[PDB]
Amino acid sequence: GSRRYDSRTTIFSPEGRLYQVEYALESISHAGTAIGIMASDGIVLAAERKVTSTLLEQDTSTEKLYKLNDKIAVAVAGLTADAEILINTARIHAQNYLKTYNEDIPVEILVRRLSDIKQGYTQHGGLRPFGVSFIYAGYDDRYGYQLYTSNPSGNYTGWKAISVGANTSAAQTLLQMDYKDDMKVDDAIELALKTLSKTTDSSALTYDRLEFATIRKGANDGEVYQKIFKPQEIKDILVKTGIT
Amino acid sequence: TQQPIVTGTSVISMKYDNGVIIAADNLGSYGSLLRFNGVERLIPVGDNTVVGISGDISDMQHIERLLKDLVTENAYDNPLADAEEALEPSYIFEYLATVMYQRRSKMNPLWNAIIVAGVQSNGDQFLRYVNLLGVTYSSPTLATGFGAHMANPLLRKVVDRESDIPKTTVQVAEEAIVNAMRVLYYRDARSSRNFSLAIIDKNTGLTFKKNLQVENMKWDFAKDIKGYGTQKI
Amino acid sequence: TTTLAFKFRHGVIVAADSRATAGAYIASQTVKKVIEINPYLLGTMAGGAADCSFWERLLARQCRIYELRNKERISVAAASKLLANMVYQYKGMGLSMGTMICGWDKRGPGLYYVDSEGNRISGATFSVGSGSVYAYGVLDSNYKWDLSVEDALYLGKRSILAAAHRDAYSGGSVNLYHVTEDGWIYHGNHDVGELFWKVKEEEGSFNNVIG
Amino acid sequence: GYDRALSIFSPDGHIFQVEYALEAVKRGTCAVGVKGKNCVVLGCERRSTLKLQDTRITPSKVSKIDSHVVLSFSGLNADSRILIEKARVEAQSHRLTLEDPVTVEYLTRYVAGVQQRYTQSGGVRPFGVSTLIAGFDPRDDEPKLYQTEPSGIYSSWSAQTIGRNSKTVREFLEKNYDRKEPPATVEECVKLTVRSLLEVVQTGAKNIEITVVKPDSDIVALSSEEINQYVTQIEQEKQE
Amino acid sequence: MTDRYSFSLTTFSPSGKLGQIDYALTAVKQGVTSLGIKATNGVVIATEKKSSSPLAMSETLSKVSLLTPDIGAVYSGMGPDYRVLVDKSRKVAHTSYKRIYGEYPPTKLLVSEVAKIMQEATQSGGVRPFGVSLLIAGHDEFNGFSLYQVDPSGSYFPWKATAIGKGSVAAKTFLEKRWNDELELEDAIHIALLTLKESVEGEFNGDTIELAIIGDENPDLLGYTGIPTDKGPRFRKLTSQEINDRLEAL
Amino acid sequence: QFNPYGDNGGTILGIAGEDFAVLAGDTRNITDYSINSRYEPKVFDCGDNIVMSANGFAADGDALVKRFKNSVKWYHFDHNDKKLSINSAARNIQHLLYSRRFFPYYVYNIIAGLDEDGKGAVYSFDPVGSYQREQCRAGGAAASLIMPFLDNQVNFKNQYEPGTNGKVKKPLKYLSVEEVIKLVRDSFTSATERHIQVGDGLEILIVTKDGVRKEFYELKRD
Amino acid sequence: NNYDGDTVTFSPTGRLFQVEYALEAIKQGSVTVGLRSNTHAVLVALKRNADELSSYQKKIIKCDEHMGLSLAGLAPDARVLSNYLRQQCNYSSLVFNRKLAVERAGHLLCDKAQKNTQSYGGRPYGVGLLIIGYDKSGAHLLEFQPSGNVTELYGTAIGARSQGAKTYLERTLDTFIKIDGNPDELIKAGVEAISQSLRDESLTVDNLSIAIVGKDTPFTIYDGEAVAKYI
Amino acid sequence: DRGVSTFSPEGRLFQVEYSLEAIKLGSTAIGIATKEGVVLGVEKRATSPLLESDSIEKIVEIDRHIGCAMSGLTADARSMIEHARTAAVTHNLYYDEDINVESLTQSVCDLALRFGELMSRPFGVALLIAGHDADDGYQLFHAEPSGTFYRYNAKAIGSGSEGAQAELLNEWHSSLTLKEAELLVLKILKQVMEEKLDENNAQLSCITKQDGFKIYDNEKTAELIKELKEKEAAE
Ligand SMILES: [Cl-]
Ligand SMILES: [Mg+2]
Ligand SMILES: [Mg+2]
Ligand SMILES: [Mg+2]
Ligand SMILES: [Mg+2]
């Protein structure tokens, strides 16, 4: 019967690892690097688009940075199509919570929900897992500014600074070196771009090969503003920090 | 739940020494309209059973098809279908009785009253009633609808109890049935003169008589009846 | 029907009549309205006999699997609640129940009223049935906590008698039960006919009745 | 639906998927449980390969199932969340139907049953998780400590450890823990729990988490400084 | 019976590759060349009508398809897979948008819905990925003109101009030299015809080329008058004669 | 509107002796003012020394009896041909009845036999499965005519010993099978006189350790 | 070899190996004998024990008052099939007030076993059955194989060493068929038949199991001291 | 790979035969049936001294008149016990009586072969079901994952089974007392166990008509162990 052709996606190896999760992580390690840095007065999200073309319409393009709601955003590393499936689920979950409790969803609760979905594909159903790793950047009134990451295993952890995708080993070392607790957003912006500039596989880091975003309390009085940077604005911040 | 539309009236029957007799008129009424005059309401099953049905005719036609299918199904992988493993009156009845009670228990009944008349393998007479409620009973005489009220009294004068059955011949039993059918024609407003009669004997087998008519009727005395009390002319 | 139950220092008394009626006709007069659920648990019957008996036997089953799974006798609160939740599924569907779950657990003697309408009430004194209203008068006036077991049994017996006399649909005989921490003890079947004349003479009550 | 039998017997009478789930537990960070005379202490290892971590928001290793019961684990982190959620739902369901909080033994029996169910159900793999469940029964002052594993078996322990290098810390506990006289106070119990982790942990900095559970729903998690004081005192006595 | 293939047929290999998606992309590579170019006042999509037989009526086989009045699509790869995707794309534009908002979806969201369908064939049980890459050109009020590519993985990218299929690498190089941000629609059509001639071997005329545009509103193609706000479809398929006229000025 | 229920009349009576039991019932079947049958058996031998009668709506009665007989058959299959005790049968029948708690069997059922100590046993049921053990119990149309007479002549209610004047009750002396059948016959003869649905015939089933015996007696046919 | 992984796969020579392996389980099972005359039908079964402390596994199952069988192979599979027969016999009685014909009972077992041989996921039944019964056409004996094949016979035997008993019955055919109105002599012929399949062990009081059905004889099983008469 | 419900060429179900190998690895359990009662005893086999041995529950009550001992993958037994308890209590609900030990055992054994591609594999545990009823008296059954159950006068399952069964072969007779059976289980357990038998690593139980199913205290068993040592030293 059909058993003959079943790959068995949800099984342990003799060493106690999940084959497909490990291979999904291998896939993600070839994806464009995405970096998240948390400061006292905001969060930075920086990400590298993969070998683009001159004919790609950049200003209407979105492959890395996505908006989940007004307070929470994500950086993607892996299969974009898989990520969009999950992103739409997360958007719906945030709205369900808002409808139920009449309050914006706490960041961790949203993260846990998505991570539980990822976990389900590793334990039952016989389907391949989502080949995606997220960096969640968000704010709420309980814990303030938060950075999380999730991977195809469905495991998630909190961070002060973190990278996903390609060259995370090198990137995480560079972040661990220059990061300090009393750091500010403008400094974190500089750190993120400098780290990408050193870890990139490209010859030089340019505006057309980047997506950038910030979550700031730099909004008029006690409230939070999401800023998805435009191509021209990424070009300006690259000059300001002294990379181009 | 429904209501009956095209209906058939009384079915009457009785046991005699060597078998059973059953009869029913050929009318299919549509309320007070005597719509269909060529309706057969006695349906033979093999050469040993006759099922007489009253009530809703569309449900009768459904039952008629179930019995036809029952014969077909019994013959499947059955080398003794025309001998030891042929359908018995008791098998046919119990099947119908099961269906009728199940249908009432789903609040969607077959709006009928049925009498299964026949002779068993061992020669025993079979005569049992069943209706839309799944209610079953047996008796030396059985009748449905108006027949219960008018025919049974006449038929019970011939066979009042079990011990009168061996003393009753086929000629006497048929005479009583034919007389009962005349009485029902006098008094049942939903009856017809034309009827069918079936005899199932353990010796002579199944005799099915069609196109019978009520005869030897008394009407002459009507000429002398004038007015409703005081009128003389 | 008349059923009652009450908590007191030495446990809980349970009493009931035995009459069953079909309109004005008395179908039976030997009905067991005190339901022996298990050796440490009692229940009462009022409203639908079938309903009360069936669901409380189905409860006994639940209470026993509990005792197996957990190696511990179920509490009166948990027992009453399993019953209440079970009958709550069939709310508005026709069930007629009015029961009292009587027992002794870690919290001491326990008594819960449970009905098909959805109520579940802990209390020290209950009486349900068409004759409840006659029984309450005698209970409320003589009920204490420092009640001797001998006196408490008589009270529950006298309270049923009061109802059996006045209520047409209550009568027959009185069944008595006493629940201890060591389990329940049956205290007999008492014909109301004989009991009435006895009580009238010894007590002086029912003066208006000629005997 | 996906019905495939993943957990099946092999010729030698082994269910490899269940045994491979134990290997995932062996990879997991070390967790330890020690019960004193009037308390239970749960210790957990945090691997220091991950720095730049936000310790405020990162999922804690010890999870409250109810106000009187806690659960720690070793193995796949994602898998543990599913067991904890189920356990928490059951704890509220028990209070709702029976009007009493779960006993520690009951809660352990439930979680162990879930783990077992995933070893003979079609289309699913076993949980790569072993748990330590600790607490106090309602209106009881006897400490309770249980352990579960992927196969579904569970048991009670005076002291126990699971996860990576659990063999070493179990060795330590077996010679240091006396049944006739267990840790009489909270200090003694925590000290023994920290001592045991120091055999394996590496640095006694932010790598050790301690959670003390006392009777009547009195649960508290120690801070870095409080733990660091234990680490200091232990090694100063060791220099002799 | 019952579909007993409830497990994924596309899975990660040790290297992290999703084999079936790669192989689907290989099928797209073998397919006939198709392209899209975006102008300031329109978009053009074009491809070769590779006739399997001269007895076959190639007019009956439409490689360029209308999805909505303002959105069109062309493909490279497996024809039958494209045909069913067009049927689904047309339907989803109604069920998940028009029946809700009373208007046709913007290009990017329709593309998003098609991409979702293709992604699910890459993860769901007992199916293979679609063996096509789509080029979807469209217009909507708030986003203006746009051109998107959709791959077997479900990934989609917006383009100023691009090509897919047989000679895509050469064609994309040709487009990079010719494209600018000041092109008029007629200039884009001219460049489309030049680019497409390089990948075509045999006959090059209006009967062997299929070409459509997203441009100005066509009130003559609406089918009714009386509602000022309804001005007609922006999608228009060029005729055989209209193509040949522009091949003389080539 | 379709009424799924009916009333086939009939009356039944179960009396429990010291080492025997009887279950009697008339043989008349009726609808409204018509007679369907003068002899339609209503009391049945169900096996394992148990007799049963489901009085009221005949279609529901026939179904319940049929199901219980089936239940006895499967009890033998499932439990190594073990004899179904009268108390076990009673509890089983409760569950058969309550299975249709929201579309009941419109019948008042009575069973009779011997308990596990060999003593006579009768059990009565209501339409939804409430059951209870009894010594003397009539069911059906003329139950109210019969039971007051049995209260007086079996249990000796309201009867006191002459000379004492209400101080000493008449003692509850055990009755023989012959004495019981006399009371049964006189009960049905009296019911036949004053109830129109009672008559034609009377069939009694007697249960002893030796087995199940039948007795039939004619009743008035008017 | 490569075509025995499941029941849904024919071999190149048109064989179904999973069915053949199920057939093999019957050959490993203990011997049982079936035979009939024109008035009665008899089952004789050699029961098997695990050891001296263990009981002897029951081989004969009653299906109705007029029908029953003996088993050889996987006992749980016999329990499933006998339960099915019990239900079918019972359906015939409740609905049609009709005792189920033995031939039709065979047709029903054949069809139930067949469905397990043509579908994926399931397995064939691992048991052989000898059905005896008395119906409206007299006494009957059937042999059921889990391939689906059901065969009406005068006599037969299945299980380990069953060929010896089958040869004996083939010689005795003309004699035992004529044993009408004599149950004890028909059982004797069955006990003598099953004795041809014995080696080392002999028929003891808790070893032997006998069943009979006939004209005025309900299906009854004899075990223990009830079969000492025939030893 | 291959079907879960596949027959081997010899006519055996692969998975059932493989589950039997898992049972051979399990701790020893012994049952002895007498006319005064049935005794059930088990080896606890704690994997560490820190493990509180009284939490090891390998002997279990099904009803007041039926007890049960297990050997093999003990986690698999929990749902079997649960079904057995439900079956016992449900029969009491339907029939107002205790359920026959054989009928209970049959109900448990019906679950056994409900596996395929229902549960995904057979049970990896064997059960000794001991009890009493009025019809067949004191009984001991051995329930396997094959769906087969044999009645036994005495039976041992687990790692030391064939050695213990040979010992039970010689020692059992129809006139054994309850006290004699208790010592006999302790004797054979002490023989096949790796560690030295005491009240903490071994457990006794019995089922009598009067008192029903009882698990023995460690103090009660300790005395029976001391009584055993003295009687073995007596000759
Ligand atoms: Cl066998
Ligand atoms: Mg007529
Ligand atoms: Mg409940
Ligand atoms: Mg009164
Ligand atoms: Mg009259």
From Swiss-Prot, chain B:
Subcellular localization, per the record?
Answer: Cytoplasm; Nucleus
* Highest taxon, organism lineage: Eukaryota
Give the PROSITE patterns listed for this entry: PROTEASOME_BETA_1, PROTEASOME_BETA_2
Q: Which UniProt keywords apply?
A: Cytoplasm, Nucleus, Proteasome
Q: Where does the protein principally reside? A: cytoplasm
Query: What GO terms describe the biological role, i.e. biological process, of this protein?
Result: proteasomal ubiquitin-independent protein catabolic process; proteasome assembly; proteasome-mediated ubiquitin-dependent protein catabolic process
CDD domains linked: proteasome_beta_type_4 (cd03760)
Q: Which Pfam families match?
A: Proteasome
Query: Does the record's keyword annotation contain Nucleus?
Result: yes
Q: Name one GO cellular component term.
A: proteasome core complex, beta-subunit complex
UniProt keyword Nucleus, yes or no: yes
Give the quaternary structure: The 26S proteasome consists of a 20S proteasome core and two 19S regulatory subunits. The 20S proteasome core is composed of 28 subunits that are arranged in four stacked rings, resulting in a barrel-shaped structure. The two end rings are each formed by seven alpha subunits, and the two central rings are each formed by seven beta subunits. The catalytic chamber with the active sites is on the inside of the barrel. Interacts with CIC1.
Q: Other remarks on record?
A: Present with 16900 molecules/cell in log phase SD medium.
PANTHER family noted in UniProt: METALLOPROTEASE TLDD, PROTEASOME SUBUNIT BETA
Concerning its family, UniProt says: Belongs to the peptidase T1B family.
Q: What is this protein called?
A: Proteasome subunit beta type-7
Give the species: Saccharomyces cerevisiae (strain ATCC 204508 / S288c) (Baker's yeast)
Swiss-Prot record, chain C:
> Which coarse location class applies to the principal site listed for this UniProt protein?
cytoplasm
**Which EC class, in a word?**
hydrolase
Subcellular location(s) of the protein = Cytoplasm; Nucleus
Q: Which residues form a coiled coil?
A: none
Reactions catalysed, as given in the entry: Cleavage of peptide bonds with very broad specificity
Q: Name the Gene Ontology molecular function terms of this record.
A: endopeptidase activity; peptidase activity; threonine-type endopeptidase activity
The record's similarity note reads: Belongs to the peptidase T1B family.
Name-wise, this protein is: Proteasome subunit beta type-5
From Swiss-Prot, chain E:
Question: Which residue numbers mark the cross-link Glycyl lysine isopeptide (Lys-Gly) (interchain with G-Cter in ubiquitin) in this sequence?
Answer: K108
InterPro entries documented for this protein: Ntn_hydrolases_N, Proteasome_alpha, Proteasome_alpha-type, Proteasome_asu_N, Proteasome_sua/b
SUPFAM superfamilies from the UniProt entry: N-terminal nucleophile aminohydrolases (Ntn hydrolases)
- CDD domains, per the entry: proteasome_alpha_type_2 (cd03750)
What keywords sit in the KW lines? Answer: Cytoplasm, Isopeptide bond, Nucleus, Proteasome, Ubl conjugation
Compartments in which it is found: Cytoplasm; Nucleus
Q: What is its main location?
A: cytoplasm
Record Pfam families: Proteasome, Proteasome_A_N
Entry GO terms, CC = nucleus; proteasome complex; proteasome core complex, alpha-subunit complex; proteasome storage granule
One BP annotation, GO: proteasomal ubiquitin-independent protein catabolic process
Add the further remark from the entry: Present with 7060 molecules/cell in log phase SD medium.
Please explain the role this protein plays, according to its UniProt record.
The proteasome degrades poly-ubiquitinated proteins in the cytoplasm and in the nucleus. It is essential for the regulated turnover of proteins and for the removal of misfolded proteins. The proteasome is a multicatalytic proteinase complex that is characterized by its ability to cleave peptides with Arg, Phe, Tyr, Leu, and Glu adjacent to the leaving group at neutral or slightly basic pH. It has an ATP-dependent proteolytic activity.
Family indicated by similarity? Belongs to the peptidase T1A family.
Q: What is this protein called?
A: Proteasome subunit alpha type-2
From Swiss-Prot, chain G:
Compartments annotated for it: namely: Cytoplasm; Nucleus
Signal sequence, renumbered to the chain = none
Keywords (alphabetical) are:
Cytoplasm, Isopeptide bond, Nucleus, Phosphoprotein, Proteasome, Ubl conjugation
Name of the featured protein: Proteasome subunit alpha type-6
> Would you identify the family this protein belongs to, as annotated?
Belongs to the peptidase T1A family.
Crosslink Glycyl lysine isopeptide (Lys-Gly) (interchain with G-Cter in ubiquitin): position given as K188
- One GO term describing the cellular component: nucleus
One matching Pfam family, short form? Proteasome
Role: The proteasome degrades poly-ubiquitinated proteins in the cytoplasm and in the nucleus. It is essential for the regulated turnover of proteins and for the removal of misfolded proteins. The proteasome is a multicatalytic proteinase complex that is characterized by its ability to cleave peptides with Arg, Phe, Tyr, Leu, and Glu adjacent to the leaving group at neutral or slightly basic pH. It has an ATP-dependent proteolytic activity.
- The record's principal subcellular location, in a coarse class, is cytoplasm
Q: Which organism is it from?
A: Saccharomyces cerevisiae (strain ATCC 204508 / S288c) (Baker's yeast)
In this chain, where does the modification Phosphoserine occur? S11
At the top level, the lineage of the source is: Eukaryota
Origin organism lineage: Eukaryota, Fungi, Dikarya, Ascomycota, Saccharomycotina
In its miscellaneous comment, the UniProt entry states:
Present with 7210 molecules/cell in log phase SD medium.
The subunit structure is: The 26S proteasome consists of a 20S proteasome core and two 19S regulatory subunits. The 20S proteasome core is composed of 28 subunits that are arranged in four stacked rings, resulting in a barrel-shaped structure. The two end rings are each formed by seven alpha subunits, and the two central rings are each formed by seven beta subunits. The catalytic chamber with the active sites is on the inside of the barrel.
